[PDB]
Design a protein around this nucleic acid. Structure first.
Ligand SMILES: [Zn+2]
Length: 264
DNA sequence: CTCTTTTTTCTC
DNA sequence: GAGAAACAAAGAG
Protein backbone atom coordinates (compact mmCIF):
# COMPACT_ATOMS: atom_id res chain seq x y z
CA UNK A 1 0.00 0.00 0.00
CA UNK A 2 2.37 2.70 -1.20
CA UNK A 3 1.58 5.92 -3.06
CA UNK A 4 1.50 4.23 -6.47
CA UNK A 5 -1.05 1.59 -5.39
CA UNK A 6 -3.14 4.10 -3.44
CA UNK A 7 -3.28 6.51 -6.40
CA UNK A 8 -4.40 3.65 -8.62
CA UNK A 9 -7.26 2.94 -6.24
CA UNK A 10 -8.18 6.65 -6.13
CA UNK A 11 -8.65 6.80 -9.89
CA UNK A 12 -10.52 3.51 -10.04
CA UNK A 13 -12.99 4.70 -7.35
CA UNK A 14 -12.83 8.13 -8.96
CA UNK A 15 -14.47 6.89 -12.13
CA UNK A 16 -16.93 4.65 -10.31
CA UNK A 17 -18.46 6.35 -7.27
CA UNK A 18 -17.95 10.11 -7.65
CA UNK A 19 -21.42 11.59 -7.91
CA UNK A 20 -23.06 8.51 -6.37
CA UNK A 21 -25.41 8.95 -3.41
CA UNK A 22 -24.83 6.97 -0.23
CA UNK A 23 -27.97 5.17 0.97
CA UNK A 24 -26.52 3.93 4.27
CA UNK A 25 -23.29 2.75 5.90
CA UNK A 26 -23.04 -0.69 7.50
CA UNK A 27 -20.12 -1.94 9.60
CA UNK A 28 -19.16 -5.31 11.07
CA UNK A 29 -15.81 -4.07 12.39
CA UNK A 30 -16.74 -0.48 13.43
CA UNK A 31 -13.77 0.27 15.74
CA UNK A 32 -11.73 0.41 12.55
CA UNK A 33 -13.39 3.82 12.30
CA UNK A 34 -11.15 5.71 14.73
CA UNK A 35 -13.57 8.64 14.99
CA UNK A 36 -16.63 6.59 15.90
CA UNK A 37 -18.52 4.70 13.22
CA UNK A 38 -21.86 5.76 14.67
CA UNK A 39 -20.94 9.43 14.27
CA UNK A 40 -19.83 8.60 10.71
CA UNK A 41 -23.07 6.79 9.91
CA UNK A 42 -25.22 9.62 11.21
CA UNK A 43 -23.32 12.07 9.01
CA UNK A 44 -22.51 10.42 5.72
CA UNK A 45 -25.74 8.50 5.30
CA UNK A 46 -27.72 9.88 2.37
CA UNK A 47 -24.84 11.84 0.86
CA UNK A 48 -23.05 12.31 -2.42
CA UNK A 49 -19.50 11.42 -3.25
CA UNK A 50 -18.18 14.71 -4.60
CA UNK A 51 -14.61 13.54 -5.10
CA UNK A 52 -11.76 11.20 -4.22
CA UNK A 53 -8.39 12.88 -3.73
CA UNK A 54 -5.11 11.52 -2.29
CA UNK A 55 -2.33 12.79 -0.05
CA UNK A 56 0.65 10.50 0.40
CA UNK A 57 -0.73 7.03 1.13
CA UNK A 58 -4.08 8.42 2.38
CA UNK A 59 -7.33 8.29 0.38
CA UNK A 60 -9.70 11.21 1.00
CA UNK A 61 -13.37 10.72 0.20
CA UNK A 62 -15.13 14.04 -0.24
CA UNK A 63 -18.77 13.41 0.76
CA UNK A 64 -20.70 16.68 0.84
CA UNK A 65 -18.51 19.72 1.44
CA UNK A 66 -18.76 19.51 5.24
CA UNK A 67 -16.81 16.35 6.10
CA UNK A 68 -13.88 14.49 4.50
CA UNK A 69 -13.26 10.77 5.05
CA UNK A 70 -9.54 10.02 5.53
CA UNK A 71 -8.94 6.40 4.57
CA UNK A 72 -5.66 4.57 5.05
CA UNK A 73 -5.09 1.05 3.70
CA UNK A 74 -2.00 0.23 5.78
CA UNK A 75 -0.65 -3.18 4.81
CA UNK A 76 -3.59 -4.72 3.02
CA UNK A 77 -6.72 -2.64 3.04
CA UNK A 78 -8.65 -3.10 -0.16
CA UNK A 79 -11.75 -1.62 -1.74
CA UNK A 80 -14.02 -3.32 -4.27
CA UNK A 81 -17.38 -2.57 -5.84
CA UNK A 82 -19.79 -5.48 -5.97
CA UNK A 83 -23.48 -6.39 -6.21
CA UNK A 84 -25.95 -5.09 -3.61
CA UNK A 85 -26.75 -8.64 -2.55
CA UNK A 86 -23.17 -9.86 -2.93
CA UNK A 87 -22.26 -12.19 -0.02
CA UNK A 88 -20.09 -11.04 2.87
CA UNK A 89 -16.52 -12.37 2.68
CA UNK A 90 -14.37 -13.19 5.73
CA UNK A 91 -12.46 -9.91 6.09
CA UNK A 92 -15.03 -7.34 4.91
CA UNK A 93 -15.41 -4.66 7.58
CA UNK A 94 -17.33 -1.79 6.07
CA UNK A 95 -19.65 -1.29 3.19
CA UNK A 96 -20.97 1.89 1.70
CA UNK A 97 -24.34 1.24 0.12
CA UNK A 98 -25.37 2.91 -3.06
CA UNK A 99 -28.62 3.00 -4.98
CA UNK A 100 -27.15 0.52 -7.48
CA UNK A 101 -24.31 -1.13 -5.60
CA UNK A 102 -21.89 -0.94 -2.72
CA UNK A 103 -18.32 -0.05 -1.87
CA UNK A 104 -16.77 -2.73 0.32
CA UNK A 105 -13.61 -2.38 2.36
CA UNK A 106 -11.64 -5.51 3.19
CA UNK A 107 -8.51 -5.87 5.31
CA UNK A 108 -7.21 -9.21 6.52
CA UNK A 109 -4.86 -7.67 9.08
CA UNK A 110 -7.45 -5.14 10.28
CA UNK A 111 -4.66 -2.55 10.28
CA UNK A 112 -6.53 -0.09 8.08
CA UNK A 113 -8.25 3.01 9.51
CA UNK A 114 -11.15 5.34 8.67
CA UNK A 115 -11.56 8.92 9.89
CA UNK A 116 -14.30 11.52 9.46
CA UNK A 117 -12.77 15.00 9.52
CA UNK A 118 -14.46 18.37 9.03
CA UNK A 119 -13.22 19.97 5.77
CA UNK A 120 -11.25 22.65 7.62
CA UNK A 121 -9.26 20.06 9.59
CA UNK A 122 -7.86 18.23 6.54
CA UNK A 123 -4.71 20.33 6.28
CA UNK A 124 -3.99 20.45 10.01
CA UNK A 125 -4.40 16.65 10.02
CA UNK A 126 -1.51 16.00 7.64
CA UNK A 127 0.55 18.86 9.05
CA UNK A 128 0.08 17.33 12.50
CA UNK A 129 1.26 14.00 11.10
CA UNK A 130 4.26 15.73 9.52
CA UNK A 131 3.61 14.29 6.06
CA UNK A 132 6.17 15.55 3.59
CA UNK A 133 5.70 16.93 0.05
CA UNK A 134 4.19 14.87 -2.75
CA UNK A 135 6.88 13.26 -4.98
CA UNK A 136 6.73 15.80 -7.82
CA UNK A 137 9.31 18.18 -9.29
CA UNK A 138 7.03 21.00 -8.17
CA UNK A 139 6.41 20.13 -4.48
CA UNK A 140 9.55 18.07 -3.82
CA UNK A 141 12.01 20.94 -3.40
CA UNK A 142 15.48 19.45 -3.80
CA UNK A 143 17.17 22.07 -1.60
CA UNK A 144 14.94 21.48 1.43
CA UNK A 145 15.56 17.77 0.71
CA UNK A 146 19.31 18.28 0.62
CA UNK A 147 19.12 20.39 3.77
CA UNK A 148 17.22 17.81 5.81
CA UNK A 149 19.51 15.02 4.59
CA UNK A 150 22.79 16.61 5.69
CA UNK A 151 21.36 17.55 9.07
CA UNK A 152 20.76 13.90 10.01
CA UNK A 153 22.61 10.72 10.91
CA UNK A 154 19.55 8.53 10.32
CA UNK A 155 20.10 5.74 7.81
CA UNK A 156 18.68 6.58 4.37
CA UNK A 157 16.07 3.82 3.89
CA UNK A 158 14.59 4.19 7.37
CA UNK A 159 14.51 7.98 7.05
CA UNK A 160 12.77 7.90 3.66
CA UNK A 161 10.17 5.50 5.09
CA UNK A 162 9.16 8.20 7.58
CA UNK A 163 7.11 10.20 5.06
CA UNK A 164 8.79 13.37 6.34
CA UNK A 165 11.31 14.19 3.59
CA UNK A 166 8.75 13.16 0.98
CA UNK A 167 5.47 11.25 0.91
CA UNK A 168 4.55 7.92 -0.64
CA UNK A 169 7.66 5.77 -0.27
CA UNK A 170 7.04 2.35 1.23
CA UNK A 171 9.19 -0.77 1.46
CA UNK A 172 8.99 -1.74 -2.18
CA UNK A 173 9.75 1.62 -3.78
CA UNK A 174 12.40 2.68 -1.28
CA UNK A 175 14.39 -0.42 -2.17
CA UNK A 176 13.80 0.28 -5.86
CA UNK A 177 14.70 3.94 -5.47
CA UNK A 178 17.85 3.30 -3.41
CA UNK A 179 19.11 0.79 -5.93
CA UNK A 180 18.30 3.03 -8.89
CA UNK A 181 20.36 5.73 -7.19
CA UNK A 182 23.17 3.35 -6.19
CA UNK A 183 22.80 4.28 -2.52
CA UNK A 184 23.15 1.62 0.19
CA UNK A 185 20.02 1.58 2.42
CA UNK A 186 22.12 1.93 5.57
CA UNK A 187 24.09 4.91 4.27
CA UNK A 188 23.84 7.82 6.72
CA UNK A 189 22.12 10.77 5.07
CA UNK A 190 24.70 13.30 6.29
CA UNK A 191 27.38 11.58 4.19
CA UNK A 192 25.51 11.73 0.90
CA UNK A 193 27.16 13.87 -1.78
CA UNK A 194 24.91 16.38 -3.57
CA UNK A 195 25.11 14.50 -6.85
CA UNK A 196 23.78 11.51 -4.89
CA UNK A 197 21.02 13.55 -3.28
CA UNK A 198 20.07 15.00 -6.64
CA UNK A 199 19.98 11.54 -8.25
CA UNK A 200 17.99 10.21 -5.29
CA UNK A 201 15.48 13.06 -5.38
CA UNK A 202 14.94 12.46 -9.12
CA UNK A 203 14.82 8.65 -8.83
CA UNK A 204 12.11 9.09 -6.21
CA UNK A 205 9.82 11.16 -8.42
CA UNK A 206 10.73 8.99 -11.38
CA UNK A 207 10.05 5.54 -9.92
CA UNK A 208 6.86 6.55 -8.12
CA UNK A 209 5.63 8.13 -11.29
CA UNK A 210 6.56 5.08 -13.35
CA UNK A 211 4.66 2.99 -10.82
CA UNK A 212 1.55 5.15 -11.05
CA UNK A 213 1.35 4.65 -14.81
CA UNK A 214 1.88 0.90 -14.55
CA UNK A 215 -1.10 0.68 -12.23
CA UNK A 216 1.16 0.02 -9.26
CA UNK A 217 2.69 -3.29 -8.18
CA UNK A 218 -0.54 -5.01 -7.13
CA UNK A 219 0.53 -8.57 -6.25
CA UNK A 220 -5.16 -4.18 -8.50
CA UNK A 221 -4.25 -5.54 -11.96
CA UNK A 222 -0.99 -3.57 -11.87
CA UNK A 223 2.14 -4.10 -13.97
CA UNK A 224 4.88 -2.40 -11.94
CA UNK A 225 5.85 -5.64 -10.22
CA UNK A 226 7.11 -6.67 -13.65
CA UNK A 227 9.79 -4.02 -13.54
CA UNK A 228 11.19 -4.36 -10.04
CA UNK A 229 14.99 -4.57 -10.13
CA UNK A 230 15.67 -5.66 -6.51
CA UNK A 231 12.59 -5.90 -4.28
CA UNK A 232 12.11 -9.59 -3.57
CA UNK A 233 14.75 -10.59 -6.13
CA UNK A 234 16.84 -12.11 -3.37
CA UNK A 235 19.46 -14.31 -4.99
CA UNK A 236 18.96 -13.04 -8.53
CA UNK A 237 21.56 -11.14 -10.55
CA UNK A 238 21.79 -7.35 -10.60
CA UNK A 239 20.37 -5.74 -13.71
CA UNK A 240 23.61 -3.81 -14.10
CA UNK A 241 26.62 -5.42 -12.38
CA UNK A 242 25.07 -8.90 -12.30
CA UNK A 243 25.85 -9.51 -8.63
CA UNK A 244 23.38 -11.50 -6.52
CA UNK A 245 20.76 -9.27 -4.94
CA UNK A 246 21.05 -9.64 -1.18
CA UNK A 247 18.33 -9.32 1.42
CA UNK A 248 18.96 -7.99 4.91
CA UNK A 249 17.08 -6.39 7.79
CA UNK A 250 17.27 -2.65 8.36
CA UNK A 251 15.17 -1.15 11.13
CA UNK A 252 13.17 -4.38 11.02
CA UNK A 253 12.31 -4.23 7.34
CA UNK A 254 13.13 -6.65 4.58
CA UNK A 255 15.70 -4.77 2.53
CA UNK A 256 16.77 -5.70 -0.98
CA UNK A 257 19.87 -4.17 -2.53
CA UNK A 258 23.00 -4.87 -4.53
CA UNK A 259 26.33 -5.31 -2.68
CA UNK A 260 28.18 -3.64 -5.56
CA UNK A 261 25.90 -0.98 -7.08
CA UNK A 262 24.85 0.08 -3.61
CA UNK A 263 28.26 0.69 -2.00
CA UNK A 264 27.76 2.76 1.13
C1' DC B 1 3.99 -28.59 11.46
C1' DT B 2 6.51 -24.30 13.29
C1' DC B 3 8.83 -20.27 12.54
C1' DT B 4 9.50 -16.19 9.69
C1' DT B 5 7.92 -12.57 6.99
C1' DT B 6 4.51 -9.11 5.07
C1' DT B 7 2.10 0.84 7.49
C1' DT B 8 1.92 3.74 11.24
C1' DT B 9 1.75 4.75 16.11
C1' DC B 10 3.68 4.97 20.56
C1' DT B 11 6.96 4.00 24.79
C1' DC B 12 11.31 5.05 25.74
C1' DG C 1 16.98 4.86 17.12
C1' DA C 2 15.00 0.45 18.70
C1' DG C 3 11.33 -2.39 19.67
C1' DA C 4 6.54 -3.58 20.25
C1' DA C 5 1.90 -3.62 19.11
C1' DA C 6 -2.50 -4.12 16.17
C1' DC C 7 -3.73 -8.76 13.43
C1' DA C 8 -4.11 -12.72 10.09
C1' DA C 9 -2.28 -15.71 6.57
C1' DA C 10 1.18 -17.07 2.75
C1' DG C 11 5.91 -18.83 2.57
C1' DA C 12 10.11 -21.59 3.74
C1' DG C 13 11.95 -25.66 4.87
ZN1 LIG D 1 24.71 -4.16 -9.05
Amino acid sequence: GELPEVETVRRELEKRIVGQKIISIEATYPRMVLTGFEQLKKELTGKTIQGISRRGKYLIFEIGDDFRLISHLRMEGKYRLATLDAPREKHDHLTMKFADGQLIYADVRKFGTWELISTDQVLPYFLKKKIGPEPTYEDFDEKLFREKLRKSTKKIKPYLLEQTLVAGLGNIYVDEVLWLAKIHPEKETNQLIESSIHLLHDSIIEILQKAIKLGGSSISTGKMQNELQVYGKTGEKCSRCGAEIQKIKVAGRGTHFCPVCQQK
